[PDB]
Amino acid sequence: SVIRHFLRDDDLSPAEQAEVLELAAELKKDPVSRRPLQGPRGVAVIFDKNSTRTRFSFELGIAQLGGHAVVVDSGSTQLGRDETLQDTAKVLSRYVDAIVWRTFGQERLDAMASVATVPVINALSDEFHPCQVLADLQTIAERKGALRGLRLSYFGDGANNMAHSLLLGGVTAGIHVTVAAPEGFLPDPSVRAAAERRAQDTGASVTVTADAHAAAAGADVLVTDTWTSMGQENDGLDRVKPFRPFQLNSRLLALADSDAIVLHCLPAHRGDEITDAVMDGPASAVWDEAENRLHAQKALLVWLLERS
Amino acid sequence: VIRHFLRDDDLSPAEQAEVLELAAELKKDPVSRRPLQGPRGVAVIFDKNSTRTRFSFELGIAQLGGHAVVVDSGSTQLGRDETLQDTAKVLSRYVDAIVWRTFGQERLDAMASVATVPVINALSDEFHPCQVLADLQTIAERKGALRGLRLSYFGDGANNMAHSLLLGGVTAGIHVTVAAPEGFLPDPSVRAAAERRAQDTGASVTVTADAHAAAAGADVLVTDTWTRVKPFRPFQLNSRLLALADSDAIVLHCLPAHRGDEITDAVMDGPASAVWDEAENRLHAQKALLVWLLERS
Amino acid sequence: VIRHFLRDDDLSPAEQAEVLELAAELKKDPVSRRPLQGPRGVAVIFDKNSTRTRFSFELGIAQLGGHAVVVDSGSTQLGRDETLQDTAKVLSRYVDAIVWRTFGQERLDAMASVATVPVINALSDEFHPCQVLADLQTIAERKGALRGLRLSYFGDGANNMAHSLLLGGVTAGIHVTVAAPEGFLPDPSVRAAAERRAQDTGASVTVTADAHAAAAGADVLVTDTWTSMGQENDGLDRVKPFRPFQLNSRLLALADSDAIVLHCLPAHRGDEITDAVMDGPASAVWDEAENRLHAQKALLVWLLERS
Numbered sequence: 075s076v077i078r079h080f081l082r083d084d085d086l087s088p089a090e091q092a093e094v095l096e097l098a099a100e101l102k103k104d105p106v107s108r109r110p111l112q113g114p115r116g117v118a119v120i121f122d123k124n125s126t127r128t129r130f131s132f133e134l135g136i137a138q139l140g141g142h143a144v145v146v147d148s149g150s151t152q153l154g155r156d157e158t159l160q161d162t163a164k165v166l167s168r169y170v171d172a173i174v175w176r177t178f179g180q181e182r183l184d185a186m187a188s189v190a191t192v193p194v195i196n197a198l199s200d201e202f203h204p205c206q207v208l209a210d211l212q213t214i215a216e217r218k219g220a221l222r223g224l225r226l227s228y229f230g231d232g233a234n235n236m237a238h239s240l241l242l243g244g245v246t247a248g249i250h251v252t253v254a255a256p257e258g259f260l261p262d263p264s265v266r267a268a269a270e271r272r273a274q275d276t277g278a279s280v281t282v283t284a285d286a287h288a289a290a291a292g293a294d295v296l297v298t299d300t301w302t303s304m305g306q307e308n309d310g311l312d313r314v315k316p317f318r319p320f321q322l323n324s325r326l327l328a329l330a331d332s333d334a335i336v337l338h339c340l341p342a343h344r345g346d347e348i349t350d351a352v353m354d355g356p357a358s359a360v361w362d363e364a365e366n367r368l369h370a371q372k373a374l375l376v377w378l379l380e381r382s
Numbered sequence: 383v384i385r386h387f388l389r390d391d392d393l394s395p396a397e398q399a400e401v402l403e404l405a406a407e408l409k410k411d412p413v414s415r416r417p418l419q420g421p422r423g424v425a426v427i428f429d430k431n432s433t434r435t436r437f438s439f440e441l442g443i444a445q446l447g448g449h450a451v452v453v454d455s456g457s458t459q460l461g462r463d464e465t466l467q468d469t470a471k472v473l474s475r476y477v478d479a480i481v482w483r484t485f486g487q488e489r490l491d492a493m494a495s496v497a498t499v500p501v502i503n504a505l506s507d508e509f510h511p512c513q514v515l516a517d518l519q520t521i522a523e524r525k526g527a528l529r530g531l532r533l534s535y536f537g538d539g540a541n542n543m544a545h546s547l548l549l550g551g552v553t554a555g556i557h558v559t560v561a562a563p564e565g566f567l568p569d570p571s572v573r574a575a576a577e578r579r580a581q582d583t584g585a586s587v588t589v590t591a592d593a594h595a596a597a598a599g600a601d602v603l604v605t606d607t608w609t610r611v612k613p614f615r616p617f618q619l620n621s622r623l624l625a626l627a628d629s630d631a632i633v634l635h636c637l638p639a640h641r642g643d644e645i646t647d648a649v650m651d652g653p654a655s656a657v658w659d660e661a662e663n664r665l666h667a668q669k670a671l672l673v674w675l676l677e678r679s
Numbered sequence: 680v681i682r683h684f685l686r687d688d689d690l691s692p693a694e695q696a697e698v699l700e701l702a703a704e705l706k707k708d709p710v711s712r713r714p715l716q717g718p719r720g721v722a723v724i725f726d727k728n729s730t731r732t733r734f735s736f737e738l739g740i741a742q743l744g745g746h747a748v749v750v751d752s753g754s755t756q757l758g759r760d761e762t763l764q765d766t767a768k769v770l771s772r773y774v775d776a777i778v779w780r781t782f783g784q785e786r787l788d789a790m791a792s793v794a795t796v797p798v799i800n801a802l803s804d805e806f807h808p809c810q811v812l813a814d815l816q817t818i819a820e821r822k823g824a825l826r827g828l829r830l831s832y833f834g835d836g837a838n839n840m841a842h843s844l845l846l847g848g849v850t851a852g853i854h855v856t857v858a859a860p861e862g863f864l865p866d867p868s869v870r871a872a873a874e875r876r877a878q879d880t881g882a883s884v885t886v887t888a889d890a891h892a893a894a895a896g897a898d899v900l901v902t903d904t905w906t907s908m909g910q911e912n913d914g915l916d917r918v919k920p921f922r923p924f925q926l927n928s929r930l931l932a933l934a935d936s937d938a939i940v941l942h943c944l945p946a947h948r949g950d951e952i953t954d955a956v957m958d959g960p961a962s963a964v965w966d967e968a969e970n971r972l973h974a975q976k977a978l979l980v981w982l983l984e985r986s
């Protein structure tokens with residue numbers, strides 16, 4: 075079999091993504107019913123930059139599949155410094171059945187996947203956050219049923235990993251995705267083109283706008299994220315002024331559908347991209363969304379392992 | 383309805399007796415209780431590393447069938463990247479209990495007010511309640527009933543072990559004496575809570591600078607590292623002091639020991655020392671506490 | 680009697696063969712042995728981190744049914760805050776074995792003098808005995824019986840791999856040659872221990888600066904990095920002395936036509952070994968890396984049974 079990897083949301087076809095999301099719902103109901111890693115077999119969970127929350131969901135999820143996660147955090151020498159990335163991948167492939175990697179540039183993930191003989195999963199990268207969006211789609215389906223035809227709007231920095239993955243993963247599910255962002259902070263053109271092509275196959279659409287009011291109107295799902303990642307704190311820009319009109323606050327939420335829900339990948343900077351009232355309010359699904367990282371990532375691993 | 387264990391008096395006398403009985407049962411049959419089978423997760427978070435505390439909690443959770451997710455001090459501090467309240471809400475979706483080594487008590491209180499799973503103080507600035515459960519297990523297995531015994535702690539009477547031996551000790555019915563120099567005495571709120579609890583159990587609280595009188599007739603003698611050190615040398619737990627205790631007295635020390643400061647080679651390697659059994663019982667007593675908290679939450 | 684594994688000759692020739700046979704059995708059936716079911720604990724302690732060593736031990740212990748408790752250098756170094764003997768006595772109450780990566784051999788000896796459970800040297804300044812068990816497992820599966828094979832090691836002849844290939848090699852009956860420049864030769868105590876063990880096994884010890892001669896007719900060619908991190912500030916040019924000992928295609932061509940090449944990794948390609956050799960048909964480095972898992976599990980099973 076071809077080894078399957080999951081480095082970006084569109085690595086799954088629409089039918090494959092539906093299979094993974096249905097498995098996520100099954101695993102939420104019966105969390106120890108799938109044991110492909112019984113043994114235990116190993117899975118590498120490697121952090122070029124620590125993310126303690128990604129650590130909880132993957133370490134526990136792997137264990138609930140019967141496996142043993144070997145967790146490497148940024149205390150270790152960064153992968154590729156002491157030894158070529160290719161050499162490390164060949165050794166890892168002798169010890170583990172899958173490699174979960176949080177890293178920076180997408181080309182590093184691509185390189186690992188080209189040489190490893192086990193599935194490689196992007197746990198979080200500069201360009202994409204596909205496991206978060208699987209958990210988001212699971213959360214939306216829990217609350218609203220069929221995903222096809224829903225309207226989702228994302229607000230804030232339109233070129234970050236969540237904007238890119240909501241575009242790609244959302245249209246793969248048949249969701250009409252809107253990115254509301256200031257000029258200068260718009261989605262990468264190759265990601266946007268990929269999302270537009272995928273939307274053709276599912277009946278979805280891609281919209282990019284600077285009009286936050288228009289993006290909120292009629293939306294079923296509103297999403298935001300922090301405006302600035304750690305790498306961007308020294309980029310020289312004022313990263314508050316451009317985004318203030320895109321804050322997810324009660325006024326924005328009241329423009330959406332009466333049954334709209336609110337998502338946010340965490341961590342949240344309350345008072346910047348989202349207000350306490352919205353985050354702690356009845357439309358917020360952020361805590362269920364965080365829980366579903368555990369279930370959606372287990373489903374993905376089960377699915378990749380059985381295909382590889 | 384969620385029970386937490388942040389200080390020794392969080393357990394009533396009757397509840398503490400239940401936990402210590404369970405600790406004895408688990409020492410005999412260490413994999414007979416599997417409330418975390420699955421595995422279910424337990425968070426084990428250190429704001430400052432304590433390797434001894436990691437071993438005992440991590441293995442204990444595994445022997446309950448669970449998986450400990452261990453976060454060492456290297457990682458960004460809990461509460462730096464998001465509110466402790468938001469962290470507690472997310473942790474409560476991934477794990478069945480939160481074991482936390484932090485500094486100030488108000489951080490523990492903040493986590494426990496929000497988390498919907500039990501929170502356990504692994505070790506803090508003000509209290510070390512899990513160590514005192516292990517100490518009480520050790521005393522019981524060597525002397526039987528705890529009620530009425532005399533325990534004396536020597537040295538820094540302001541630290542977490544002095545506070546927890548006062549509260550946990552009087553909760554078990556033990557007459558507790560802290561022997562300490564004048565600048566290093568128990569916190570007055572802790573001392574008062576121990577005096578009140580002592581009225582329920584028949585116990586008592588004494589604080590003195592007279593190490594000789596603290597040692598005379600003691601059944602259990604305890605010390606701890608002293609951290610500038612001249613004030614503690616008269617409270618050194620040495621052979622002279624131990625010679626004053628009741629026959630078959632036992633010496634405890636939470637470790638690590640600095641041999642030649644707070645305790646001598648002769649006392650620590652001698653026949654009264656129960657320091658190695660004490661260390662082993664961190665594993666059993668902490669497992670018992672988790673089983674008990676999980677059942678009531 | 681508690682059995683420890685601090686240096687390669689801690690096993691007799693017969694005992695080493697038992698461990699290597701077990702390593703082959705565990706490679707075939709990796710979860711058939713569960714001496715640590717429970718789980719029981721095993722301490723895995725790193726005075727200096729080695730992520731690649733952690734993976735093999737942590738997974739191997741789990742596949743024996745146990746739980747590895749890992750301590751790395753972010754914690755207070757063992758010995759600083761209490762005696763090593765006190766720490767050994769407490770660890771012995773929590774775990775069934777102690778795996779330790781540390782520096783001088785006296786530290787390992789101190790731990791093992793008091794521990795009531797097996798102590799295993801995961802990697803130290805003087806020896807790397809678990810790696811050589813994995814090397815011997817690899818040689819055996821590529822060449823068959825070990826007795827009488829000719830193995831040559833190239834590079835820094837005073838490092839942990841040279842010492843362990845000497846001791847573990849002659850324990851298996853292998854004729855071991857160390858090819859190294861003057862000033863970088865095996866420790867005399869280690870060389871003498873290997874010479875004495877070789878008399879029991881029919882093996883031999885050779886130390887030479889003639890890299891050509893060491894490669895000629897060799898069945899196994901081995902190298903390692905020329906510098907450990909603790910040596911970077913030692914004041915020596917640690918490149919020019921070792922260039923003649925590079926494991927390159929010209930050197931490999933001198934060996935037996937069926938020769939294999941070993942390297943404990945990570946490799947610095949272009950220094951001690953070239954891409955052509957690393958990636959060519961004689962290289963066994965990836966199987967070697969895998970066999971760390973199996974050989975270490977076999978060692979643990981064997982020590983636990985005897986302790």
Ligand SMILES: Cc1sc(N)nc1-c1ccccc1
Nearest residue numbers: 150151153162165730731734
């Ligand atoms: C994933 C990482 S990161 C590092 N310093 N080493 C490794 C590694 C792990 C297993 C095998 C080889 C290298």
Ligand SMILES: Cc1sc(N)nc1-c1ccccc1
Nearest residue numbers: 433434437750755766769770
């Ligand atoms: C292995 C290490 S490292 C450190 N600072 N303490 C310990 C330790 C662990 C368990 C018991 C006693 C000490």
